[PDB]
Every structure is written in structure tokens, then in C-alpha cells.
Amino acid sequence: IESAGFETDLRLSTNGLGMCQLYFWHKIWRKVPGDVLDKDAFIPKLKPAPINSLSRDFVMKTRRRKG
Amino acid sequence: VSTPELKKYMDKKILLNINGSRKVAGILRGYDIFLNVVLDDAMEINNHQLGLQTVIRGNSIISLEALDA
């Protein structure tokens, strides 16, 4: 989710020297630093949420898309 | 120059059709670039075995037709 713009960020920032590749093999996974169920999580409203809760964010969103 | 590819026939019983309308049988043990054959012994074709192991010269071989598949 953090890689949405990564490649072009890199390739420009170095003035065309450099390169990047993003690939998914080992199928690693990781905890999202938030706590999935919390009422008090801070909803940034147009900002990237603070790391203390990113999970309550992601879930409170996906549940809105689904239903 | 190149080795006769008889590694398929290694450790199998073969009818060595040999010079002068004769025959030999026996399990294949080895060979060389001249096509000499070293084989664990068998009969001369009614029938009679001579030797424990046998070595056939290259020139003498008409054919070595496989008894086993």
C-alpha cells in the first residue's frame, strides 16, 4: 500500500540514474501497527493516518466499501 | 575418435554375432574406442560355456544384438 508511487519517485529523484523493481514471491505478510478494534482511533480526514492506528483505519474503510 | 555409445547395453546379456558365421552370448561388462568387448561369460552357439569372463576383439564383431530389451 506504500508503494503506490514508489518507482517513479525513485527514478526521477536521482535524475534518471537508478532503477527499481517491486516483486512478491516469498509471500511474506506483516502486522499493521494499529489495533483493529478501537473506538478512539484518529481519522485524519485527507491526511495519511498516524501509525498508532493504521489498522482501525483500513478496516473502518474496507467495511465501508463492502457494506 | 568418438566412444561407441554402448552405455544402454551395459550390464545386459548380448548376442555377439562374431566373424565366420559364429556367435557368443553374455552380460556386457566393458568396451573401448576400437569396439573390443569385455563380457561375463556365456556359451558359443547344441551349446557349451567356456570361461568365467570373456574378451572379444573389435574387428571380430559383426553385430552385438541385445537379448534383453
Binding site: - | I61, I62, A66
Partner: protein, 82 residues
């Protein structure tokens, strides 16, 4: 190197016919050939010089004792010669 040898090699796979010094014609799938025409063949019939025929599995023949080899006429076409 010999072009006949090359031809023989090419004929690998195909059903070649094959007479010896003895005059004992064979006909079979050519398994392997070498510079010295040390042919191996599969599913091979074996005619005696007198007349009678005998089926046999995987014959080996040493080119020294080979007389002439018939290859299929498709190989005439291409692309060994030029």
C-alpha cells in the same frame, strides 16, 4: 568430414535399411550413428542371405562390416547438401 556420414546422422529417427558384408539385410529406426558407421537400430527385421526373416529388438552394427545403407527419400530434399 564425410557428407555420407552426415547424411547417416540426419537419417537418425527414420527407418533405414542396412545390408552387411554377410548379406543380411536389416530395416529399422536408426537410433544412433557415429563417424565410423557404428549404427544402432530399433524394431528391426533381419533377413538371412538365403531368404528367411527374423524380427529383433535393438540391433547394433559396426560400419566395418556394413556394406550399404538405404535412407528414406525425404532426406534427398534438404538441408545437408546445400
Amino acid at each position: 568430414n564425410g557428407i555420407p556420414v552426415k547424411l547417416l546422422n540426419e537419417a537418425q529417427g527414420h527407418i533405414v535399411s542396412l545390408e552387411l558384408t554377410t548379406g543380411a539385410t536389416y530395416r529399422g529406426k536408426l537410433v544412433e550413428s557415429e563417424d565410423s558407421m557404428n549404427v544402432q537400430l530399433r524394431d528391426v527385421i533381419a533377413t538371412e542371405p538365403q531368404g528367411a526373416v527374423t524380427h529383433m529388438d535393438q540391433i547394433f552394427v559396426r560400419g566395418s562390416q556394413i556394406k550399404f545403407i538405404v535412407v528414406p527419400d525425404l532426406l534427398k530434399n534438404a538441408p545437408l547438401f546445400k
